[PDB]
């Protein structure tokens, strides 16, 4: 009554619907097993956490700006005027059982979300997963990053703790007023009044439960549909031509490791949602516009923005009776970088000439100027971030505060040039380091030559050898070639027994002969498939 009822309900599902065609198409789909192809899954797998916590945070949070005295449990805030957003965020922190944990693992899931989006953008950038067939997928993923950034900024500003209330005052109301023609108009449309306009926090709650995460969920749905139906890309390797995806199928293997990786991402978020404090809004105060911190720094995925405020050197213009302030520039500048980050595949489609349907990836050493432009962007992000904690860097690492913001202000101009030089020539030297492992072998320990005194490194060749001390030099194929005989089948047979006690020797012989024959069968089947493609 456990397999018979499964067969009966399966024939019922096949009777009502006719799914088995469009289920077999799904659970025979192959995803490749490279590790970096899990990175964007983190941006999925934390995002579901952001719903599963976040829904829970919706049914306790009360947005308002109606000024209430606390009269609750938290003693250093009693009788103090606070917005009811902050009061019920304090109630999430201290009243409800396991409430501080759910809101902390929610904030940590937001950090892992907006950081894994950046890690995965680094993946699909430097591996070249964005040219011709997947450029719209880059565009909707880039827009998904923009919505992630703005929506998280609506997130930690949603209680008006004053560390983020001054973040609204800096970013969302100083830059918004600082836009030339229609700046004040979109400010007073966004707030409905002055800066503590009484319908800001509920408007952010409206945009932040549903209105931006509805668009984020729609773009993730269409995004994973573009990854799903239009097949996944892959690195080139042994049996990996342009028009096939090699790897594991969905049903026995990929579903198990994907669900287990969802569970381990949730484990990392839960461990660091418990063991590490985040946004301690009771240590912070209610937002009152006459008191600040010293840090006053945003969350890290937006620290490149007002760090760009912290580094742009006070250039204001004054036309005939008006004022362009500094905040126009970064309102241009954030509009600049996004217009380079959305529209990059069309930019280098124009520059390079990549008018070809690319499915195989390119290793990020194989494309040195694009990896170097990318490392310019990575190090420029790291500079604009690492000079946004300008304050606390100059605090702890004892530097003059003026000195470290000048270090940033020169660094955003000269350090992309330095990292472009180092990145371009480092990619070319990584190419040359695995283009001499083909013309020579793989390096090992030293033998001396017998009749005279020499020292050869005793290279182990990768392909066919000639009759003498040099092999037939292979051609490059976009693959990671192994540079250690370690990573080949050399000395990789320890005792199979236990960590403390050995198994009997016939069992060791059976296990190592069976595993050796299975690995031999793996490379034999992959090699004969590779010969079937060309032959």
């Amino acid at each position: 009554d456990f397999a018979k009822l499964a067969a009966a309900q399966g024939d019922a599902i096949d009777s009502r619907y006719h799914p088995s065609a469009a289920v077999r198409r799904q659970l025979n789909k192959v995803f490749p097993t490279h590790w970096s192809f899990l990175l964007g899954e983190i941006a999925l797998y934390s995002f579901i956490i952001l719903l599963l916590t976040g829904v829970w945070l919706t049914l306790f949070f009360d947005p308002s700006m109606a000024h209430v005295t606390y009269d609750g449990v938290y003693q250093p805030l009693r009788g103090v005027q606070m917005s009811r957003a902050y009061e019920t965020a304090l109630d999430i922190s201290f009243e409800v059982r396991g409430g501080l944990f759910v809101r902390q693992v929610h904030h940590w899931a937001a950090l892992m979300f907006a950081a894994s989006i950046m890690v995965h953008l680094a993946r699909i950038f430097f591996t070249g997963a964005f040219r011709r067939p997947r450029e719209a997928n880059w565009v909707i993923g880039s827009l998904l990053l923009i919505l992630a950034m703005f929506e998280g900024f609506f997130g930690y500003s949603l209680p008006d703790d004053l560390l983020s209330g001054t973040g609204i005052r800096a970013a969302l109301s100083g830059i918004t007023m600082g836009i030339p023609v229609i700046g004040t108009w979109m400010h007073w449309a966004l707030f409905g009044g002055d800066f503590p306009g009484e319908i800001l926090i509920p408007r952010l709650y409206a945009l932040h439960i549903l209105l931006i995460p509805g668009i984020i969920l729609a773009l993730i749905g269409a995004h994973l549909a573009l990854v799903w139906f239009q097949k996944h890309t892959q690195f080139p390797g042994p049996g990996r031509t342009e028009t096939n995806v090699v790897g594991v199928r969905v049903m026995p293997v990929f579903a198990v490791k994907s669900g287990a990786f969802f569970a381990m991402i949730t484990g990392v978020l839960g461990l660091m949602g418990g063991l590490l404090t985040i946004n301690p809004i009771w240590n912070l105060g209610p937002y009152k516009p006459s008191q600040v911190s010293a840090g006053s720094q945003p969350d890290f995925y937006m620290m490149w923005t007002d760090g760009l405020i912290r580094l742009w050197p006070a250039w204001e213009f004054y036309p005939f009776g008006h004022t362009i302030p500094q905040g126009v520039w970064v309102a241009v500048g954030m509009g600049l970088v996004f217009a380079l980050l959305i529209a990059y595949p069309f930019i280098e489609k124009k520059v390079t000439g990549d008018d070809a349907h690319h499915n195989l990836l390119q290793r990020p050493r194989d494309v040195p100027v694009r990896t170097a432009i990318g490392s310019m962007a990575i190090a420029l992000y790291l500079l604009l971030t690492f000079a946004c904690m300008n304050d606390i860097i100059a605090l702890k690492f004892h530097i003059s505060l003026n000195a470290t913001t000048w270090i940033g202000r020169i660094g955003m101009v000269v350090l992309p040039a330095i990292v472009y030089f180092v990145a371009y020539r480092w990619a070319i030297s990584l190419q040359r380091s695995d283009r001499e492992v083909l013309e020579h072998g793989v390096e090992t320990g030293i033998i001396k030559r017998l009749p005279h005194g020499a020292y050869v490194e005793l290279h182990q060749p990768l392909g066919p050898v000639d009759e003498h001390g040099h092999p037939i030099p292979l051609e490059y194929a976009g693959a990671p070639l192994p540079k250690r005989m370690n990573k080949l089948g050399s000395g990789g047979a320890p005792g199979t027994g236990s960590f403390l006690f050995p198994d009997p020797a016939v069992e060791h012989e059976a296990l190592t002969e069976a595993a050796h024959a299975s690995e031999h069968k793996s490379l034999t089947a992959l090699k004969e498939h590779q010969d079937r493609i060309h032959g």
Binding site: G128, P236, G237, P238, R240, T241, E242, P313, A314, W315, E348, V351, T352, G353, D354, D355, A356, H357, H358, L360, Q362, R363, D366, V367, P368, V369, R370, A372, N402, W406, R409, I410, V413, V414, A417, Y420, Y424, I428, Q431, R435, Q460, L462, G463, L474, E475, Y476, A477, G478, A479, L481, P482, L488, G489, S490, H520, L523, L526, K527, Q530, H534
Partner: protein, 92 residues
């Protein structure tokens, strides 16, 4: 020794004529591998011009303007040396 060969037929491509030869960079057909060099010359020169424009601001510490002159003169010296060596074909 427990490895197979690797063979990848890509879509190889300007189409393999103008750019960098496959002996200057060891894999030029496998991806985009040459920025045009006037772009990086004018990028360095415009970087140094931006560092020289950065004097204009709220400013009383003139110990900084010597750093701006220094990091602008280093970039102008590198760009000028690099352009002069390509004007003479990498000589002296």
């Amino acid at each position: 020794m427990s490895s197979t060969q690797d063979r990848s037929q890509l879509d190889p491509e300007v189409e393999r004529h103008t750019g960098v030869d496959v002996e200057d960079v060891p894999s030029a057909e496998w991806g985009w591998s040459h920025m045009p060099i006037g772009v990086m010359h004018i990028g360095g020169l415009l970087s140094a011009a931006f560092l020289l424009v950065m004097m204009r601001g709220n400013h009383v510490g003139h110990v900084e303007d010597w750093f701006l002159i220094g990091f602008a003169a280093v970039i102008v010296a590198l760009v000028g040396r690099n352009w002069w060596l390509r004007r003479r074909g990498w000589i002296r």
